[PDB]
Ligand SMILES: Cc1ccc(C(=O)O)c(Nc2c(C)cccc2S(C)(=O)=O)c1
Ligand SMILES: O=P(O)(O)OC[C@H]1O[C@H](OP(=O)(O)OP(=O)(O)O)[C@H](O)[C@@H]1O
Ligand SMILES: O=P(O)(O)OC[C@H]1O[C@H](OP(=O)(O)OP(=O)(O)O)[C@H](O)[C@@H]1O
Ligand SMILES: [Mg+2]
Ligand SMILES: [Mg+2]
């Protein structure tokens with residue numbers, strides 16, 4: 077195996093052989109790959125049109141180098157709530173959804189990161205709320221048990237990935253690496269709500285989760301958002317029993333009104349943090365509807381471990397988690413945990 | 417203009433706008449591009465399938481940064497003989513040998529060259545072994561061409577700013593659009609030449625660049641895989657003339673050449689390849705001679721195109737053969753070596 081071999085096969089518009097993608101990623105995750113080599117592989121992989129197997133191999137190598145949590149500290153039915161990002165458009169729907177879902181009794185372990193293209197990101201907003209994001213495996217495990225939620229800071233759990241992260245910021249363009257985020261949660265939850273900004277690559281991610289036999293809903297808003305949108309219909313690749321099925325989704329059937337895309341606008345960590353306190357404070361509006369919708373999506377995924385009645389219960393549990401104030405309190409206990 | 421803009425448009429598989437490829441190359445040449453950005457741009461440009469316009473812009477930027485030769489020192493009918501390389505076949509240095517023969521036939525040759533990348537010995541390496549001084553500067557290369565009839569432009573001496581792209585090319589290994597630039601960026605800027613291309617899908621692109629320059633060039637690719645006019649089989653020739661390109665297929669059998677085996681054209685290190693040159697110029701008959709005479713003749717046909725197809729090849733094959741048989745080629749090499757030590 078070598079760089080000329082692998083890179084040459086891609087430029088010829090051919091799919092890689094089994095195991096070649098793994099080799100390339102291991103060279104990167106061990107510091108035996110110069111930036112030039114990293115960039116060439118990332119671009120070539122993207123333009124060739126990657127397969128589920130190829131992307132699956134990349135994520136597998138990252139997890140094998142990642143810091144794991146202590147044995148038997150992660151529940152069997154833990155869920156993730158995270159997106160690829162890079163939609164170009166907003167408030168932190170995934171982070172807000174995560175708090176609600178956790179408060180509803182579903183164990184959540186988020187694997188997030190700072191912003192890359194947006195004015196603010198998930199981890200950035202959590203830091204602005206006083207949450208300690210840079211905790212080690214032992215403490216993340218304690219947090220999950222004592223609070224009901226844990227946050228895995230990618231740079232701390234994937235320290236060997238820093239070389240690849242540097243190259244990404246230099247080339248600046250979206251690549252296959254932009255898909256690896258949701259696919260490399262070090263806690264390894266078996267369920268989650270996974271957003272994808274790239275419509276022509278969502279089916280691929282769904283394939284990767286299908287191989288792991290996970291219960292996941294890969295979602296893409298017809299308006300382009302990497303979330304379950306309320307401004308129009310959405311596409312959903314439901315993953316269950318290792319089987320993917322493509323379906324169109326419309327929340328208007330449940331009773332959600334249509335919203336404009338500007339009504340879901342956001343800003344910096346300070347402004348987005350305020351949007352979190354507002355929604356968790358019980359404020360109604362288009363932002364709330366987006367959070368409840370996504371939170372329900374994560375609960376439907378959790379249940380996958382009927383279709384319509386699952387959404388009804390999901391929407392019901394999500395709303396109640398907010399209105400009782402359980403979501404607001406859970407956040408407070410999350411902060412106090414870090415200070416102790 | 418920015419890297420995200422350019423790289424984004426290429427990954428979406430769209431052709432660039434005017435000046436974008438040019439902006440990209442200038443950033444690389446001025447040392448303002450990160451190695452990762454250089455690699456991303458090279459690979460993206462290749463997989464999209466580049467156009468004659470785009471490849472043309474890159475070569476234009478390189479030539480603008482290159483060291484020029486003095487004014488009115490290069491004949492208007494000077495020719496080049498050089499290939500992309502990277503054919504993956506370790507052969508004797510046919511372009512270099514052919515270049516000497518063409519020069520000896522009375523056609524001024526100014527050769528763009530460099531050391532080997534994948535092979536054991538490149539043109540520059542072999543010339544060094546023969547005692548030829550390749551490290552000459554602009555003023556001295558012009559003298560050589562005038563006094564000897566041939567001059568050698570060593571790429572890194574004339575293209576010092578290309579060094580950033582050079583280091584990246586070696587780190588990634590895979591061939592890209594950058595592999596096409598060498599034959600396209602001869603600093604003497606000859607209006608004719610025989611250009612070898614190892615990549616069949618890109619040969620038509622190189623011909624488009626020369627056509628835009630209104631040059632008389634034969635872009636050649638052996639159907640066996642060589643970046644030369646081969647003797648083992650037919651060869652695909654993109655005939656560039658009058659701003660137009662015409663794809664043709666050349667068959668040496670039509671001119672009484674014998675089919676050879678590729679192993680007969682094999683080479684080795686610098687010391688070995690140097691000896692191979694002395695053999696052919698010495699008048700040794702065989703498959704290597706036939707290859708050199710054909711490529712030499714090809715360059716003469718391109719030269720005549722600056723002003724009939726079959727009749728031109730006939731005349732071309734006469735002058736190439738005669739250039740060796742009279743010993744002019746052997747004499748020109750020796751005088752070339754003496755010039756360096758003087
Ligand atoms: C100054 C210069 C200009 C051009 C080239 C080239 O490869 O064409 C070049 N390559 C090169 C050379 C000759 C020697 C050593 C290292 C390199 S590198 C690390 O740059 O590839 C150096
Ligand atoms: O456009 P970007 O610059 O790439 O930002 C998108 C953010 O969303 C992703 O995580 P996550 O979905 O969990 O954050 P979210 O709450 O905003 O959705 C990603 O980690 C980014 O932080
Ligand atoms: O190492 P490679 O990448 O495989 O290329 C072999 C040689 O051919 C090219 O020039 P040129 O055609 O002028 O030299 P030549 O006489 O051998 O043909 C290149 O500059 C190398 O010197
Ligand atoms: Mg998200
Ligand atoms: Mg999003």
Ligand SMILES: [Mg+2]
Nearest residue numbers: 498499511612
């Ligand atoms: Mg050659």
Ligand SMILES: [Mg+2]
Nearest residue numbers: 499501503643
């Ligand atoms: Mg060659």
